[PDB]
Structure formats: structure tokens, C-alpha cells
Amino acid sequence: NEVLALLSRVEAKGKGILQQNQIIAEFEALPEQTRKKLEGGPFFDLLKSTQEAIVLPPWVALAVRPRPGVWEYLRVNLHALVVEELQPAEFLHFKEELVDGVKNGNFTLELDFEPFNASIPRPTLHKYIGNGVDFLNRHLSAKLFHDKESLLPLLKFLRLHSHQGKNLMLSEKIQNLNTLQHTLRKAEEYLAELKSETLYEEFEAKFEEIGLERGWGDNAERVLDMIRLLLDLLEAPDPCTLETFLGRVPMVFNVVILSPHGYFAQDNVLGYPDTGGQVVYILDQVRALEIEMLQRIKQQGLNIKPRILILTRLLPDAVGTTCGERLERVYDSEYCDILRVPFRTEKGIVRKWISRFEVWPYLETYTEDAAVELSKELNGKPDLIIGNYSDGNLVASLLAHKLGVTQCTIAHALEKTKYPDSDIYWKKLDDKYHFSCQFTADIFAMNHTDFIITSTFQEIAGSKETVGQYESHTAFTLPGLYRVVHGIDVFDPKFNIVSPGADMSIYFPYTEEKRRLTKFHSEIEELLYSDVENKEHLCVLKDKKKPILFTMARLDRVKNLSGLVEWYGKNTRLRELANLVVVGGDRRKESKDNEEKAEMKKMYDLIEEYKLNGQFRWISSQMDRVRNGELYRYICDTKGAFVQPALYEAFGLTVVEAMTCGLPTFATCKGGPAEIIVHGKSGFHIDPYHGDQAADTLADFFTKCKEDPSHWDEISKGGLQRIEEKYTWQIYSQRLLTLTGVYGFWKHVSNLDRLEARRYLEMFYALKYRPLAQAVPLAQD
Amino acid sequence: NEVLALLSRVEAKGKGILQQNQIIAEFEALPEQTRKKLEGGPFFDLLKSTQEAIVLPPWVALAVRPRPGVWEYLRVNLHALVVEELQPAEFLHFKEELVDGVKNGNFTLELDFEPFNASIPRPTLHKYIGNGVDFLNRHLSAKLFHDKESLLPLLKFLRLHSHQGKNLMLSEKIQNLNTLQHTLRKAEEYLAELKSETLYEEFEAKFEEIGLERGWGDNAERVLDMIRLLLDLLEAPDPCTLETFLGRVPMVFNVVILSPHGYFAQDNVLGYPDTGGQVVYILDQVRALEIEMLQRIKQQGLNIKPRILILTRLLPDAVGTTCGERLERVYDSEYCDILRVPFRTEKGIVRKWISRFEVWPYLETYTEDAAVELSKELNGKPDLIIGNYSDGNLVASLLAHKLGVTQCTIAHALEKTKYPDSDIYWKKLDDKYHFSCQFTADIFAMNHTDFIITSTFQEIAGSKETVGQYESHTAFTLPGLYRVVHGIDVFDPKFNIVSPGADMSIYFPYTEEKRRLTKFHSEIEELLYSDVENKEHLCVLKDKKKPILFTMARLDRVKNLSGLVEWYGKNTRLRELANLVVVGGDRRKESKDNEEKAEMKKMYDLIEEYKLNGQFRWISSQMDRVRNGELYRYICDTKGAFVQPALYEAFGLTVVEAMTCGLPTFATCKGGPAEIIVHGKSGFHIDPYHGDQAADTLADFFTKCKEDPSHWDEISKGGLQRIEEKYTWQIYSQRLLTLTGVYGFWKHVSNLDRLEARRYLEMFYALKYRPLAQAVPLAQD
């Protein structure tokens, strides 16, 4: 039935040479098409699952995505019956012709990691995506099972393992699997007799004689389980045993965390350009980590003092902050300090703030300087290094290589998905965003790291219909620069989902009166309802009694708050029902950020266009997380709602924050919030691409709530539960330390294979990143 | 021996901060020392093994080389007993301080090809150096023994094997080892009965039925063996069988040879800048190669017509030459042609000759055009591509990648060894020699190719005392650019020694009278003995009856012709015994080559300084090999000798030519001739660094020869027999075709592992070569 397909195919051409997302790809052609559809059936499934379609004059190329992480590419003749299967490289040719007019010159670069990763087989099952350690535990457990040469790495590992000159686990006396096998048995025999609560100090003398150093446990009971797990691993390995053992071995003492860009600090920062959830995440992370690290250290019978350092930039000139000081104790922790190192060039240190899109030329020297400073601060080298975002992941990768430390990376966001078609359109965007530097770093850190943590499944593989954040890096091209044929694989065993949370001392249900912070109510009321218009707040709320539609975020284009303002301004029904309150941007000072400055001008116009005075309150950056918690709960009092209208949102901590306070939430369906919220149950999804619908959806909510105030309560509970089940810090740390254990061991078992990748990556950094990063215009004081 | 040892490092550290050379390094120290020479204990064995030593005040660094192919680097304390073993990369660190003042930026590029070669085990035996095919054969032979998943590749090979639309060996009717085994057997039984000389045509009908296509042999006998061999590979694989069979499969039909630089032609060229033994080598090669290819095509029952294309630059302004015509038939061949393609830019084609040192920016476009052209010339694609020197090897790799063809490289020289310390001092030599480009190319091709051909062992691994040419590329560094930690390995199984020869119809014993070409006597006698001084010959021989000390070569610095002249001018004894005749440089025209110009001036000066007139004849480039053959024979008549005083000579075809004609040779001990000649037996060695001794050795020889004439004859015979045994063209062809067969099959079996190394190279060409070559300033017409 070709008379039909050609209908759709001639639909596509009318659009002309260009990119088409499934948004349009199906939208225009299938539904906006005449009843000639009469389709269902085959080719509807195919078209529906098509992720994007590249239209050039004679042909349309289709990237088809049947299942998450499964792709096939196709060229079809616009007017013709012909359909040919494209290879990934071939499809990317198309994209390139669309822009340069020409596919990349024959000997232009193809990045291919596929042949490197081939060391260990790939899972094909949806169930292991974001579960990679489970896959690895099972593969190690098999490789280890009765293989002499296979067990040795474990022995050597334990035998060399030490911290600060104090030997741990096994001593130099155990040279082979028999001696070890023997000692473990003698030790189990001895220990099996003594009382459960017997301290390690009692039998310590005996152990040292037979070659057993500290770290097996604090008391006899614990030590015995350890030694049994090990006998079991030498004997009949199984995944749970392997994981349990490797996780329990004391390893992580000194931790190094990289977060160079933005103003990273504990006060007077959140809401400035580049300063946001990542900062909030890390501060919550180390506190939890330190608590867990102490616990384990003790349980294993050790007195070691842990140290966690957060490496960021020293910013001499940002007044009102502590960003100027080299060392800062993290609030509410004993062992976590922030360690600030300055950017510099031959001419000396660079004072001024620099956008995260511009920091590339400063990162290498930063790595050098950082290694020195943490060397001054740490006693013994780092046992774990975690990279954060692009710059951090970059720096974290260089250090991990330099010092030989187990590496983890966390994206926190991936710009290629926040800025659609920014890969194929990279060149027109470069003077401004330098995405050629950043995509390079991303691709680099991504394959350079030992493991990767994501906050959600969708961050890796997306959903059934839409592609993941990482998955979108599998095949792309930057025409004129290079072409990534396989840059990452959603099925990679290194991906682990470990979900964060909000700090339950700061954020809790609005309904616990005892804990409500009333001392903030005077300020909050002035902040919302006052009649004064100034750099802190603009316009004025006429009716103090309505529900409040609330939002808070950095002000940049993707966050798309100006968009919400418009949706709101246009909808008379929604303006009638509720007041709009938007926290974003800091109007106290001159904005040095491109998008934010731009975004502020829109905001000012929108205020005039829709005559927003009386329904709208535009608040500047709210920098105190403690008062912020109260603010949310106050929105709760008005029986209002939180809305997150981002064009794309990588994770969305504020979504978690509101749900946690019991504030019903409407979040963008693009990115992480799609996973966080179960629509109808834990809150509602809205599409930033249809805003008027978004507004009407909200109007519907406030109307239902008016007629039935219990509707409100339903979602508030739905949300609260979702958070209890899904996003909380208690479990996070333990997961992290265990991951660190397993991948740490895997690192040695698999070292021989990863040398080819080691050197490929080295060359990529040296001959691609460095040149690009050096071409970036330097900040001038 | 703590007393003695302290005493050497003592004298060493006085020399200052500089390069320690072995000859230099040991010379001063041990011999300029005392009876402390009682060091004939262990420490001395390590000193003479030292290849070079880096001098920096606190430490000295030593590269030690116990056996060829085995290096260990170490640093002891300038004043101390401390000796600490160095990683190769740390030794190279040392070398980098000496120049730039500090090491290479911490994150600047290290090339390591080691982990990319691991697909197969390294031979550790001196016996296997240059013998790699023998080694690769025993690996295949073993991997091929009763591993089904192993044998399939051989079947796929024979099944897919075809040429020019005609199907060869196995048909598509054979889908598996089972029916293959069945058919072959069925074929054996039948053929075993027929008369030996029965033509394939007779039993062809039957064969086509059972799945057997042409190529097994011309008669029943030959088909019988070929089939029996294959049956054997399926049953009990052994190296002799594996090789013998893979060599028999008709394979090489179309051959592409790359030689872009120089004036490449059959006349009016030899002696011009860059135009030399490579050109002479290649013409002899294709002629020989064509005879074998026809022979092999006939024997396997095929009628295919071969094609050999020699690809070089088209030079439209080189007059007197054929260098401006796109296609030229090679002398004395049916199927070999020179194919010339022009260099060009956006601006159009580039007419003027460019030094081989400057060709780099044009080579990539050369490849594209070349491909288009050799495509028009060839029926089907290349079955083999052979690269030559640096530019040729660079182009040959790009082509083999683009076309998917078996690749072989032949160095012909490696400049890094011709220009001492040109790697470490590369920066100041670069605006002139562009060695950053070249060395990059050299390493790129060296690893990129399937197999490598060398003319001698020394070219690869050197000698026990001295380092080999490729071997010197194993670890080196170019401060500020990159560091090669492992660039090549002398034991790599891809190395193969196949020695060239002289064309026996041009060069032969001076004592076969019927053959002497006497029609050349008048011209030659004028050349040597006339009293006319002009651009053809300078100065004058006063005495026509003295023996002639003879040399012929391109005129450049490394050839050190000016050196020979000085030595001779200074030595009254030698001047008394013989006349000096030197052919080099073309003074008919104005020289456009740097080194030639510089070298010409030296020559002129030496003429006046040593008042050489009457003892000396300086002859311009002799471009006709035919008469050139006679010129050698004529020197023999005078009972003269050939002398080759190069500072380094990669091979020395003129040494082969001289020995072939009966002319006793004295050749430089640096480079290939060290292997060609057996001192005292087939000729003599002289050390260009001690030239006065060179001059005396010559003097001694002539004196002895005057007292006992039969002394001359001994060497002449030694020289002849030596040539007969080692260097002759007959064997060359077979070996080369067999190599292609074996390396060809291997290409398929080992492809998966080579996939990693394939991308490493691609990125290295792309991000390192391309940018450098583009830095090279273009020629201007």
C-alpha cells in the first residue's frame, strides 16, 4: 500500500530541508493528516517510535528507537518506495550535509569507544540499565569461581591494601592462595570459640602472628563473618557474597570531590548564575557520606580520621561570600572542608567570576594546583574521587589518572539535552557557549571514569517513548569538528542509579506545627505580601488570601520562568484563582550572566504586557535554605502549588523539595521530573511546549480544590509518600561506598584491558580538548 | 668495587650538562682513566652496553642495551652509591629537561602502541627479528588446529575470493567446513585417477558442480597438491603447510606503489635532489615482481592480466624529464606503469618541485586525487599497496584504509637516525626539516601497516654494539611536542627482511669481456681523464695510470662527500697512491636544494684549500644506469676501489653495485653497509667519524695491492660471492607475494583486536599529523 506512505513522505518534504523531532515528526504527518490515516497496523509503530527525522531534498533519514538503548537508522526516498538501512556513521553523514552542505572531509575524526568497552560482555536487558554493579558482581563471581589466576588479584589487593602506613587486612606473610586459605581456616577455628562481644584487641596478637592485620572487624562476631565471606569467595563465589565482602572492606577514608564552577558556598550564594542544585546536592552528600564513613571505620575496628574535601574555585572578589577563603568547614560536619584553589595563568591569578561555559582554558593548571593543595591537606592520597558536571568531571578525570585513584562521575546535567540540536548546530553557538569544549569534556569524562552515578533511570535511558540524557550521547556529530559513532552505551555496567534526597531537617511536611519555624513569618509575609517594590521584589499582590502558585530557581533560559509568567499572564481563569510568585535572578546587583540578564528583560516586559501588577510577585534569589523550607510550607498554607516549567530539567531538586513539604507539584515532563512524579498520584506533568495547556491544567487543579479541598490533600499525601519510597539520603552513602568497593576491585582485575582505552582517552584529551580549551578567550581583570 | 665506580661517574659529571654518546660516553671515561681499568669486573659490561647517557648535575641517566631489542633505563647519583631503575617515560623525562628546561607539560601526549599490538605474543629471540612471518605462521598454525570457530575464516576467505567479477577457489555452494571437507575429498578421489598433465579445462565441468571454481592449478597435478594442502589445514595445521598454501592462492593481481617525492623517472633524473636509490629500487622491484605475478597467475590456471602502478607526483615544469606525463610504461615490462598525479591546493595545481622535507601539506589531497586516478587505471581494486619512505608510507596508509587493501611499508631510510639528536633538538631544525611532520608520519605508517619490509637486519635491530634504525624509534621524545614511550618493537612479527639486489644486466663482473660495453669507452675516458673543466666535470687528473678511488651519490650533508674529499686532501700517502673521482651534484643547473648548495661550496673550497687539482676529478650526476654499470667496471680496470663515506647510510645500493662489478669496497660502518660487507672478506669498513684513519686504511690497501696484486683480487671475489649469497632479486618477488598471502589472511582473523589500534591511529593522523602538516608553509609558483 504505497499510495499511503508517499502521503506521509510528501508531507515531510513540504516542511523542507531540516530536523524534525517526534514532536513534529508524527504531529504534522500522521494526526494532522487527513483520515487517509486509516492506519494503526505496521509502519505506524515504526513511525511512532522514530526519535528524529533528517529531511534533505530527495531523502528523509530516520533514527528509530524501538526500546530504550536500541536504535536502527534508515534512509527512505521522499518520493519512492525505497527504504534502506543506514549504519550509524552513515546516518550522521546526513546530519552533517544538513548544515555544512558537506559531510565531514574523509579523514576527519570518528570517535568510537565500542571496540574499547568490548572487554566485558554487555547486558541486553532493561533491568540492568542503571543497575550495572549487579551485572558486574555476577560476572566477577563467575570469573572468580575456581580460577587460580582469577583469585590472586583479590589476594594481592588485600595484601597491598593499607592506609597511612598502617597495614590492613592481610600482611606480607601471605604469598599464595594456600597460605591465605590456610590462615583464614585457622582464624575461623580460633574465633569460632571466643565470646561474641570479644574486642579485636584481645585476639589481635594471635592474628598478627598468622598474618592477619586490622580491618576485619571491631569484635569477634563481625571478624568471623568477614573471614567466612572470604573463605566462601575463594571456595564457591556468588554475587551477593562478593558484593557484601568488597563493600565491607575498609577502603574509603580520604575523599576528593570536584566542583570548580559557580560560587560554591554555604550561604549568600544559591541562585547566582551557575549556583544551584549541584551545590545543594554535594553539601547534603558529604554530610551523609561522612556519617556512613565513620560508621564503617568503627565497625571494622579502626581509629582512622576521615577527610572529605570539596575542590572548587577561589573567588577573591565576590563580596558577601566566603568564596574568598581557602578552607571552609561544612556546616554540621566534623571532617568535611571546602578547599578553594584559584584560577591562574602566566600573568598570575585570575580574580573575576567566570561562567561555567567559559572555564575551559583554566582547568588543566587548576588540576595541577589542586593536586598540590589537597596533598597539603590530606594524610595519604585520596581513596575516592568524584567528579561533578563537565568541568568537575574533566578535572576529576585528570586527577584520578595522576594519583591513581578510583573515579566516579556525576553529570548533574548534560547540556546537549538542555540545548536541542546544539550538537549539529554547535558552530553557530560556540563564541557564546563553547559547547565544542564541553561536549568533548563530557564524552571524555564519561568513558574515562570507573563508575557513574545518575539521579534517575531517565538520566541514562529515558522512557519508552523518549530518549535518555546519556543515551543521546551514543550517536552524535559536530559537523566540521568530529563525529561520535558510539560515544556511550546505555547498557554500560558502569551506570548506577543512586537517588538523592532533600535534607529532612530543612524540608518536612507543612503539617507538623511543632517544627514549623514561626520566627520567619514576619519576613516571609513582607517578602510575599508587602507593598514595597525594589531589587528584592517587584510588583505587589493585591489579594493576600488566594492560593499561591510558586516557583524558585536560577534564572536562565532553559529554566524558562519567563515562559510560566506568560502562560500565567494569558490565562484569566488561572489569574483569578491564584497569585503567581516567582523567585529568580538576583536584582540586588548587576547581572554578569548572559542568559540571566536576557531573561530579566523578558520578565520586565511580561510584567508590562499582561499588566501583571496585583497578581504577581517577582522575588530575587533566596539564599537561605533554612528559611526556604519555611517558605515552601507557607505556600502550603495558602493551599497552593509548586510549578516547574523548565524546557528541560536534568533532575529537579526543587521538585523533591516541594513534594517533601507536602506542596502539590506540577513539573516539566522533559527530563528527570518525568520520573520523579507519577502523574495523577504524586503530582502532575506539564509540557513546557504547550504552555496554555499547562496553565489550564493548573486552573483545573485550583478549581477542583475549591469545590473539594480534599483533592488538594490527596496529592500532597501522594507526593509525600513518593518521596519516602524514592528520594532520601539514608541509603545513598552506603550504596556509594559499596560501589566504590566493587569498582575499586574491578579496576585491578580488568586493568590490562583498559590500557588501550587509557591511551585512547589520553590522546583525546591532549590532541582535542587542550587545543579547543586553549582557543577559548581568557577572562580579563 | 665502590672505589673504582665512584671514579668514573667522577669524570663523567665534569663534562657538563649534555649528551653522553657511548663512543663519546665510554671513550673519555674508561680509556682516559687509570689502571682503575681493573674494572674488568662486572661494572664494565654495563658501561659498554650503555647506548647513551644524559648528564644533569645531581644524576646521570643511562639507557642500557644488553642485547638488541632489550633496553633498561636507570639513573644513579652523580656523587653517590645510589642507582635507581627508571621507567622508559622517566628516562625520556630526563631528556626533556635538558632542552626546554622542564619536562613536557604533565598532561601532554604520550604515545604508547604497546597495548594495541598485544593481539599476538612477542617473540623474544634474536632469531625471529626480521623473521616475523615465520612466527605468525606458527601462531596461525596453532590457532588453526581443530578450532572450528577458527577455520571458518579460511573458508569465508576462499568463498568470497574473486577478481574482476570472476569467481575463484570455492563457490557459494559451499557454506560450511562440512561440505568443504566433503567436496575437497570428493575432488581428491576423482583427480587422483587422471593423468598428471591433464588441463583444468577437462575436469572443470565436474568441479563447478561440486562447488570448486578456478585457481587451484593449471593441471591435475597442481590442483591435486593445492587441494591436499587445504585438506591438511583442516586436519593437522603446520607452519610449512599454512604458508605454502596461503602463498599459492592466486591473490596479487593489481599492485599500487607509492613514491611521491623526488623526480621519479627512468632517465635524466638519478642524482637530482631526492632522486636516488629509492627510485632505482622501485624500478627493479616492479620488473621482478611482474615476472613472478604472471608466473603465479599462469600456474594457478588463470588468464588475468596484472597491473602494477607506481604513484608519484606529476611535475609539469621539470624539463629534460618525463616527469610531466601522467602515464609512462616502465622499461622492459608489459604491465608496470608510472602514474603521476599533480599536487594541488584550492588555488589550483602546484607546478614546482618541492623538497621531500616540505611535501607534507599536499599529501592528503594527493591521496584523494591518487585514488580517483588509480581507480580509472585499475580493473577492480588494488590487491596490495606498498608504501615507500615517509610521504609514500603516509599516503599508502590513507589509501589502504580508504580502499580496504593489504598494506606493506618499506622505509628506505629513517631520518631520525640520519640526523643525530634530531628528535630531541627537533624544534630548532623544524623550520628547515619539518621533522615534527616526518617522524609523526613515520610512526603512524610504521604501526598502521600490515607488514614491514627491510633490506637488512641492522635496519631493524642494529648490531650487538649499535642500535638499529627502527629500534631507535622504540622510545624517544620530542620536547614540547610529544613523547613516544613505546613507538615500535624490534620483535614485532610484522617485520620481514627481504634483501634487494642490482639488475644483473646492468651490473656484473668487470672480467667478463664479451659483456663489457666498449662503445662507452670514448665517453668515459673523456669523463675521467680529459683536460676540459666545465659543469659536467671539474678539475683534472694529471696522471692517467694511477688507480682510482671512486664514489657516486646524491650530494647532501649525510652523504658526506665533502668529508671524503677533505680526508683525501690531507693524506699525502693516499694522494700519492690514487686519484679521487667523485660523482655527485648536478652543476649543469642552478641547485634548488639546500643541502646540495651548501655541499657544493664546501667542495669548491676544498679544491682550493688542499690544492686538489691534478689529483682529483669532480663529476656531475651520472643519470644513465647502463653506462654507469660500465663506469664501475672501468674503475676495476684501474685496480681502483669504491668508497662510501656517509655519516649514516640506511642501505647503500651503490655498495651492492660496486661489489657486483668486482670493485673492492670501503663503506661507512654507520647504517646498513655494516651488514652488507664482511670486513676483510667481502670488503672493508671505515668510520666516517675517524676520517684520517679512513684515509690511511685506503692507503694501506693500495700499498698492499701494489706489493701483492692478488690482494685486490681476493677482496673482489669476496665481494662477488657475498653478493651472490645475500642480495639478489630472484627470491625477492616470491617472498613478497607469500608475505601478502599470509599477512592477507591474518588481516581477517585478527581484525577484531586491530580495531582498537585502528582508531588510535585514525585519531593520531587526524589530530596530530593533519595540524602539523597544515603548519608547513606551501610552495609558491
Ligand SMILES: O=c1ccn([C@@H]2O[C@H](COP(=O)(O)OP(=O)(O)O)[C@@H](O)[C@H]2O)c(=O)[nH]1
Ligand atoms: O533562588 C534560589 C534558587 C534555587 N535554590 C535552591 O537551589 C536548588 C536548585 O536545584 P534544582 O536541581 O532544582 O535546580 P538546578 O540544580 O538546576 O539549579 C534547590 O535546592 C533550591 O531550593 C535556592 O535556594 N534559591
Ligand SMILES: O=c1ccn([C@@H]2O[C@H](COP(=O)(O)OP(=O)(O)O)[C@@H](O)[C@H]2O)c(=O)[nH]1
Ligand atoms: O649521480 C648519481 C648518483 C646516484 N646514482 C644511483 O642512485 C642509487 C643510489 O642509491 P643508494 O642506496 O646508494 O643511496 P640513496 O640515494 O638511496 O640514499 C644507486 O643506484 C646509484 O648508482 C646514480 O645513478 N647517479
Ligand SMILES: OC[C@H]1O[C@](O)(CO)[C@@H](O)[C@@H]1O
Ligand atoms: O544545569 C546545570 C547547572 O545547574 C547546577 O546544578 C547549578 O548548581 C550545576 O550542575 C550547573 O551549574
Ligand SMILES: OC[C@H]1O[C@](O)(CO)[C@@H](O)[C@@H]1O
Ligand atoms: O635518504 C634517502 C633518500 O634517497 C632516496 O633513496 C631516493 O633516492 C629516498 O629514500 C630518500 O629521498
Ligand SMILES: [K+]
Ligand atoms: K595489606
Ligand SMILES: [K+]
Ligand atoms: K571464491
